[PDB]
Amino acid sequence: MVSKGEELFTGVVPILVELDGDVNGHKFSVSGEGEGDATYGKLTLKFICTTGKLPVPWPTLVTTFVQCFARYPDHMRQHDFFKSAMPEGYVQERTIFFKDDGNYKTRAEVKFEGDTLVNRIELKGIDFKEDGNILGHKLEYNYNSHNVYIMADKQKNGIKVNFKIRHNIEDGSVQLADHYAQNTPIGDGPVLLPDNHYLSYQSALSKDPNEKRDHMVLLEFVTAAGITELY
């Protein structure tokens, strides 16, 4: 049978993203809107920096900006924590270590508000180099494909997640961003605690030719894998 959480994602769902950030005292806010289609693992989102110029590169916020939209194969449904926590939602905590630079700490609440799936984020960054790749805006406006590794954390009734992002630097090098995370339900009811598996991501960044505010357009596909003799 289709679970209550699964049922919420059977069609296209509107998304709202709201972020308040402070990186080395540079304060900023971002709003985002679009839609998720979990059946295809598809996100289409547009973000606006509502406070003026974004003081970090847009690519460094991609991972922060709704894993409930991952496409979980039928055979992996019992491993989809994110949908199982809905509609009450889950809290995602991350630390993102930029190699040879500062770190972000993020707290996101992911839940439904009516028919809208909301991703509400606080981000705090410290210890950045004011002339490094982040505060010096030396990252290319592009994005590589990565895997995100998920394991259960039974003690916390949630999951632990880790992955490495490689951001291309304008000189042909790479800026590593090591991510460590925890996701835990907001409500008190049962959730799906998964076996070890991963999510496979691909992301494309673009611009809206009619948009004059500092912004990012994101197309992202996300598919669960790693658990698989019928043939």
Q: Which stretch binds Cl ion (CB under 5 A): 2-10, 72-80, 176-184, 187-195?
A: 176-184
Q: Is 161 in the site for Cl ion (CB under 5 A)?
A: yes
Q: Is 158 in the site for Cl ion (CB under 5 A)?
A: no
Q: Is 181 in the site for Cl ion (CB under 5 A)?
A: yes
Restricted to residues 18-57, the positions that interact with Cl ion (CB under 5 A) are: 57
- Of 58 and 104, the one with the shorter C-beta distance to Cl ion is 58
CB of 37 to Cl ion, least distance (A): 20
Q: Is 96 in the site for Cl ion (CB under 5 A)?
A: no
Q: Is 58 in the site for Cl ion (CB under 5 A)?
A: yes
DSSP the chain: ---HHHHTTSSEEEEEEEEEEEETTEEEEEEEEEEEETTTTEEEEEEEETTSS-SS-GGGGTTT--GGGSB--GGGGGG-HHHHTTTT-EEEEEEEEETTS-EEEEEEEEEEETTEEEEEEEEEEES--TTSTTTTT-B-S----EEEEEEEEGGGTEEEEEEEEEEEBTTS-EEEEEEEEEEEESSSS----PPSEEEEEEEEEE--TT--SSEEEEEEEEEEES-----
Q: Which stretch binds Cl ion (CB under 5 A): 33-41, 102-110, 153-161, 199-207?
A: 153-161
Q: Is 61 in the site for Cl ion (CB under 5 A)?
A: no
Instruction: Give the interface with Cl ion as residue ranges (CB under 5 A).
Output: 57-58, 161, 181
